[PDB]
Amino acid sequence: IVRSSVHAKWVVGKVIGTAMIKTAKVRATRLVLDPYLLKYFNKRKTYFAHDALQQCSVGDIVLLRALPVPRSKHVKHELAEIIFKVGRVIDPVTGKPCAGTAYLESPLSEPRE
Amino acid sequence: EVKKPAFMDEEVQRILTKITGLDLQKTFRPAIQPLKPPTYKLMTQAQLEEATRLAVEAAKVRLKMPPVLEERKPINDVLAEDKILEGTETNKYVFTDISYNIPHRERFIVVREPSGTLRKASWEERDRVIQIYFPKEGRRVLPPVIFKDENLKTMYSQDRHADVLNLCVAQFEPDSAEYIKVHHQTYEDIDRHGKYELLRSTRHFGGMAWYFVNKKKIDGLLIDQIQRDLVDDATSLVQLYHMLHPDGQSAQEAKEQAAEGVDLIKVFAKTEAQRGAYIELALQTYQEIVTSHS
Amino acid sequence: PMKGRFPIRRTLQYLGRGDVVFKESVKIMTVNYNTYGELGEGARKFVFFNIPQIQYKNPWVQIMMFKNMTPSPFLRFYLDSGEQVLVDVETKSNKEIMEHIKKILGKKEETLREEELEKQQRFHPGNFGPRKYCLRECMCEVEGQVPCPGLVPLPKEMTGKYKAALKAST
Amino acid sequence: RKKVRPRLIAELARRVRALREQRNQPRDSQLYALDYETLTRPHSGRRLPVRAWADVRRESRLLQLLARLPLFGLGRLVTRKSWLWQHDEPCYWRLTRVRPDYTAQNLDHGRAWGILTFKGKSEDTAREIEQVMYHDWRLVPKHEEEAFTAFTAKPEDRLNSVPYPPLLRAMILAERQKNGDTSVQEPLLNLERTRMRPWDYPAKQETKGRAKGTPV
Amino acid sequence: AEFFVLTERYRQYRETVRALRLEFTLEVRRKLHEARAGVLAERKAQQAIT
Amino acid sequence: KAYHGGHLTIRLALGGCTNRPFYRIVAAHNKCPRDGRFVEQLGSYDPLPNSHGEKLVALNLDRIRHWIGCGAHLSKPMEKLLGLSGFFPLHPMMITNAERLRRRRAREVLLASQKAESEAKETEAS
RNA sequence: UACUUAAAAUUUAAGGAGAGGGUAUCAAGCACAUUAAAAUAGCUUAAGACACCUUGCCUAGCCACACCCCCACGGGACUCAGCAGUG
Ligand code: FES
Ligand SMILES: [K+]
Ligand SMILES: [Mg+2]
Ligand SMILES: [Mg+2]
Ligand SMILES: [Mg+2]
Ligand SMILES: [Mg+2]
Ligand SMILES: [Mg+2]
Ligand SMILES: [Mg+2]
């Protein structure tokens, strides 16, 4: 069960496109140090990921797992997880639906619905 | 047999540290070196006292005494005598093991002589080659010329004894004959001219007092400690003398009379002092000044 | 005057002051913080002051930050095993956040010292070579050894020009 | 990148060249032919070393001996003049397979296989024989086989263990004392595991190279 | 006389050097195994997980 | 360069200036240049006597043992150096050459005695 | 080089955290994508694609070249960019 050669064994990014069949185009960003300014800026990379169930929508944050063998020239990752769904975020700390910096369902309540 | 006290014995280190003393201004005297602009901090009386405490902690590490060891024994061991190689070489070969993680006193440094004998490198040969391959800041491959008696006497005239000793520690090994020679020459010069103050608040004071105690010539250091109002130090010196010479007449006299404090110094004067008459006179004069003024 | 606010953040000394060196397991650190609020002030200060120091010591870790997506700020680390470590940094100072992450996912001082010594194993003081790699280029530099002919002329008898002349004379 | 482009001519050349080599492979009768007047190989022009001149005129090749025998001398014993002169103990090959060079007009070039018995010690398996094209081979007569192959092994007298070198011995004894091992045993090297064959021992013909087929 | 004496020196010298090359070859593999799967190696691996 | 074939070797790399030789003991692929790319430096050899009349050899005996254990060959000058140190047995040709030098000086001593005897005959003639 | 199986040196192939010359009057490239019933219409690009121009760089050294046609079956204008030397 050897792992991939690619450095990006785990990458987080935003789904910037989903027009290919069973594949989601994801934009990841990393921080790179400008040597002259000594300030960090964002370098963005595109990763094709295998979305077997076509469960991805543009704008949602996702976690990708490097495939052991590249599926194609560009598809070398799969959709491990959807960290945040676009417009359907669930607060990790409390577990309640949220809509921005607000709770759609109060954490005091226990709807269990 | 009651063990002879050692230099590193926790009791000896306590007494030697006390008589040495501490002086943050002398211990941290400004170095004549490339300088940088000073920094400044606003501190309360508590913060300042904390900073002074750290300075005293650092002054303790700075005053750590250098080892006092006995003279090493010449290395004279022949590993082999391959006579087939006799006359085939004109110069000696010196082979040094330069594996990084070996202590320098556990490295194999051998010499193949022209006669064919394979022998271990002598102590002088070991120190030279270890400097050539593991160079130590402060040490030079060849013995410097400042350690010649004429050159050393010049340093003594300038009252640079702490420098002669700091150089002797950078260049020579503690167990070498050259190390012992220079130290015993500096300590002897301090004695004759009563320059004991030069090595106070320095790491070299302990070895000097150690040398005097073993050589039974603490008279000068006691006379000088008393005249400087350091009579607690003089008493501690007489305790160290009664510790390294337990069977001495002075040590047995103090047990008989259970002497303590100033009594210990008076006992030493009568029994084993080379110049007892003066120790009492200086001790008496100190008592008169203390009693008369206070 | 250096541009921006707190230009000290753009100096190598400040970037090197960071003490959080993550374990090899750490692969991603997402930072979820809010730009407005009162309980998220430490999170905002952590992004402003500390994220540069963390990235500087952990260049291979992906730090991705999301703004105003949740009611409260939190940190989520993604490890190589597949584990996800959630940290809640609400009502927590930026200094508190750094100490927390250092404890749970930061290498200890002992481990870092061992790595430094291992890195320098192949440098030997006795080794001779260029200044970039070695202290001394040639044995002529060592005291007592034969000096370089360029600086000091060699004795005639030690020269091939002289030795060749004698062989012809023989 | 993407401006790196294919090299078809290089691909075509490599394959074509390799194909020609297989088609025009030379034979042993050509590679190992000799002109005895000059002692130089016509295929390559290589002049034999001087120490081989006497034997090239005075000794026979292996398949010159075997071409005169029924079944190309399968089962016969063959020795080399070089071995006879160097080693008192019997050295010979027991022939098992023999592939003559049919192209040769006298069937005097080819390959052979057999079981080696060097200095009285016999190998357990058959392998190809090296130096078959040398002028050094002597067929053993059938009536003399029993006397030739008679060998009685002597007790081995070459030392099995030797001292360590002077410096390496002191480093071993020093480590013993450091680790607390107190002993006066002398470090000894064991030579049994690493004993060398004689320099003239037959080598592996299967892994040996063959000369190319381009004439000089 | 000298050719034979020299031929024997080469055989005996090369046997001694082969024994030493083997001794060195074993220390390399022993040291490698201790680092890879020594006592200390195993403890640190579990200590980290705990 | 991109070498194909060859083995690691322990050899002496020549440094210094004209009439001032100095050697670096190094482990290197055999096809590399004498003073070029190496794998590790295993010591140094200064063949010129120093102020004390000592030729100085430095050997990293821990790394040397490591590379001999991994197949590193030895050059003949380095085999001679290890023999003088005592780490290896004396090389066969070191012993043979020492014997040749002994036989060559014996002839010279005998010839000088013969010349002195011939000179003695001249003394007898007067 | 050891074992008849394991330690190296040295390469090769496929890759990618990041870094990597100039011109934007080079602003579009034109198959450059995914799926795997063989359909879908996608892929790169002002965060600089594509095009063109220039340059050995990564410096214990590395890379490329070896008369010319990127290559070298073949062909041609048919060999010192090894040392010395010549026009
Ligand atoms: S640089 Fe060392 S001899 Fe010249
Ligand atoms: K070309
Ligand atoms: Mg041969
Ligand atoms: Mg224009
Ligand atoms: Mg040309
Ligand atoms: Mg070409
Ligand atoms: Mg030229
Ligand atoms: Mg040429």
JSON list of N, CA and C in Angstrom, two decimals, chain C residues 64-84:
[
{"chain": "C", "resi": 64, "resn": "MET", "atom": "N", "xyz": [-3.35, 27.52, 5.09]},
{"chain": "C", "resi": 64, "resn": "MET", "atom": "CA", "xyz": [-4.43, 28.15, 4.34]},
{"chain": "C", "resi": 64, "resn": "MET", "atom": "C", "xyz": [-5.43, 28.74, 5.32]},
{"chain": "C", "resi": 65, "resn": "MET", "atom": "N", "xyz": [-5.76, 30.02, 5.14]},
{"chain": "C", "resi": 65, "resn": "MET", "atom": "CA", "xyz": [-6.57, 30.77, 6.09]},
{"chain": "C", "resi": 65, "resn": "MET", "atom": "C", "xyz": [-7.90, 31.18, 5.45]},
{"chain": "C", "resi": 66, "resn": "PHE", "atom": "N", "xyz": [-8.99, 30.97, 6.19]},
{"chain": "C", "resi": 66, "resn": "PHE", "atom": "CA", "xyz": [-10.34, 31.30, 5.75]},
{"chain": "C", "resi": 66, "resn": "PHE", "atom": "C", "xyz": [-10.94, 32.31, 6.71]},
{"chain": "C", "resi": 67, "resn": "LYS", "atom": "N", "xyz": [-11.67, 33.29, 6.17]},
{"chain": "C", "resi": 67, "resn": "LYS", "atom": "CA", "xyz": [-12.16, 34.42, 6.95]},
{"chain": "C", "resi": 67, "resn": "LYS", "atom": "C", "xyz": [-13.68, 34.42, 7.01]},
{"chain": "C", "resi": 68, "resn": "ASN", "atom": "N", "xyz": [-14.21, 34.65, 8.21]},
{"chain": "C", "resi": 68, "resn": "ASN", "atom": "CA", "xyz": [-15.64, 34.92, 8.42]},
{"chain": "C", "resi": 68, "resn": "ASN", "atom": "C", "xyz": [-16.52, 33.80, 7.86]},
{"chain": "C", "resi": 69, "resn": "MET", "atom": "N", "xyz": [-16.09, 32.55, 8.07]},
{"chain": "C", "resi": 69, "resn": "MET", "atom": "CA", "xyz": [-16.86, 31.40, 7.62]},
{"chain": "C", "resi": 69, "resn": "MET", "atom": "C", "xyz": [-17.63, 30.72, 8.74]},
{"chain": "C", "resi": 70, "resn": "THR", "atom": "N", "xyz": [-17.27, 30.98, 10.00]},
{"chain": "C", "resi": 70, "resn": "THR", "atom": "CA", "xyz": [-17.88, 30.34, 11.15]},
{"chain": "C", "resi": 70, "resn": "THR", "atom": "C", "xyz": [-18.05, 31.37, 12.25]},
{"chain": "C", "resi": 71, "resn": "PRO", "atom": "N", "xyz": [-18.90, 31.09, 13.24]},
{"chain": "C", "resi": 71, "resn": "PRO", "atom": "CA", "xyz": [-19.07, 32.05, 14.34]},
{"chain": "C", "resi": 71, "resn": "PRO", "atom": "C", "xyz": [-17.83, 32.24, 15.20]},
{"chain": "C", "resi": 72, "resn": "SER", "atom": "N", "xyz": [-16.98, 31.22, 15.34]},
{"chain": "C", "resi": 72, "resn": "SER", "atom": "CA", "xyz": [-15.84, 31.29, 16.23]},
{"chain": "C", "resi": 72, "resn": "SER", "atom": "C", "xyz": [-14.56, 30.90, 15.50]},
{"chain": "C", "resi": 73, "resn": "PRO", "atom": "N", "xyz": [-13.41, 31.43, 15.93]},
{"chain": "C", "resi": 73, "resn": "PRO", "atom": "CA", "xyz": [-12.14, 31.03, 15.33]},
{"chain": "C", "resi": 73, "resn": "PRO", "atom": "C", "xyz": [-11.61, 29.71, 15.87]},
{"chain": "C", "resi": 74, "resn": "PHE", "atom": "N", "xyz": [-10.98, 28.93, 14.99]},
{"chain": "C", "resi": 74, "resn": "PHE", "atom": "CA", "xyz": [-10.39, 27.67, 15.39]},
{"chain": "C", "resi": 74, "resn": "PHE", "atom": "C", "xyz": [-9.22, 27.34, 14.46]},
{"chain": "C", "resi": 75, "resn": "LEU", "atom": "N", "xyz": [-8.39, 26.40, 14.90]},
{"chain": "C", "resi": 75, "resn": "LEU", "atom": "CA", "xyz": [-7.28, 25.87, 14.12]},
{"chain": "C", "resi": 75, "resn": "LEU", "atom": "C", "xyz": [-7.52, 24.38, 13.92]},
{"chain": "C", "resi": 76, "resn": "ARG", "atom": "N", "xyz": [-7.33, 23.89, 12.70]},
{"chain": "C", "resi": 76, "resn": "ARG", "atom": "CA", "xyz": [-7.44, 22.47, 12.40]},
{"chain": "C", "resi": 76, "resn": "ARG", "atom": "C", "xyz": [-6.18, 22.00, 11.69]},
{"chain": "C", "resi": 77, "resn": "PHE", "atom": "N", "xyz": [-5.46, 21.08, 12.32]},
{"chain": "C", "resi": 77, "resn": "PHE", "atom": "CA", "xyz": [-4.26, 20.49, 11.74]},
{"chain": "C", "resi": 77, "resn": "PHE", "atom": "C", "xyz": [-4.60, 19.17, 11.08]},
{"chain": "C", "resi": 78, "resn": "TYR", "atom": "N", "xyz": [-4.05, 18.94, 9.89]},
{"chain": "C", "resi": 78, "resn": "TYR", "atom": "CA", "xyz": [-4.21, 17.69, 9.17]},
{"chain": "C", "resi": 78, "resn": "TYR", "atom": "C", "xyz": [-2.89, 16.94, 9.20]},
{"chain": "C", "resi": 79, "resn": "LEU", "atom": "N", "xyz": [-2.89, 15.74, 9.75]},
{"chain": "C", "resi": 79, "resn": "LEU", "atom": "CA", "xyz": [-1.68, 14.95, 9.93]},
{"chain": "C", "resi": 79, "resn": "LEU", "atom": "C", "xyz": [-1.55, 13.92, 8.82]},
{"chain": "C", "resi": 80, "resn": "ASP", "atom": "N", "xyz": [-0.34, 13.37, 8.70]},
{"chain": "C", "resi": 80, "resn": "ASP", "atom": "CA", "xyz": [-0.05, 12.43, 7.62]},
{"chain": "C", "resi": 80, "resn": "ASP", "atom": "C", "xyz": [-0.77, 11.10, 7.82]},
{"chain": "C", "resi": 81, "resn": "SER", "atom": "N", "xyz": [-1.02, 10.72, 9.07]},
{"chain": "C", "resi": 81, "resn": "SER", "atom": "CA", "xyz": [-1.76, 9.49, 9.34]},
{"chain": "C", "resi": 81, "resn": "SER", "atom": "C", "xyz": [-3.21, 9.58, 8.89]},
{"chain": "C", "resi": 82, "resn": "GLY", "atom": "N", "xyz": [-3.73, 10.79, 8.69]},
{"chain": "C", "resi": 82, "resn": "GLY", "atom": "CA", "xyz": [-5.13, 11.01, 8.41]},
{"chain": "C", "resi": 82, "resn": "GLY", "atom": "C", "xyz": [-5.90, 11.58, 9.57]},
{"chain": "C", "resi": 83, "resn": "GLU", "atom": "N", "xyz": [-5.27, 11.74, 10.73]},
{"chain": "C", "resi": 83, "resn": "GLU", "atom": "CA", "xyz": [-5.91, 12.35, 11.88]},
{"chain": "C", "resi": 83, "resn": "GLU", "atom": "C", "xyz": [-6.07, 13.85, 11.68]},
{"chain": "C", "resi": 84, "resn": "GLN", "atom": "N", "xyz": [-7.12, 14.40, 12.29]},
{"chain": "C", "resi": 84, "resn": "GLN", "atom": "CA", "xyz": [-7.40, 15.83, 12.23]},
{"chain": "C", "resi": 84, "resn": "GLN", "atom": "C", "xyz": [-7.49, 16.36, 13.65]}
]
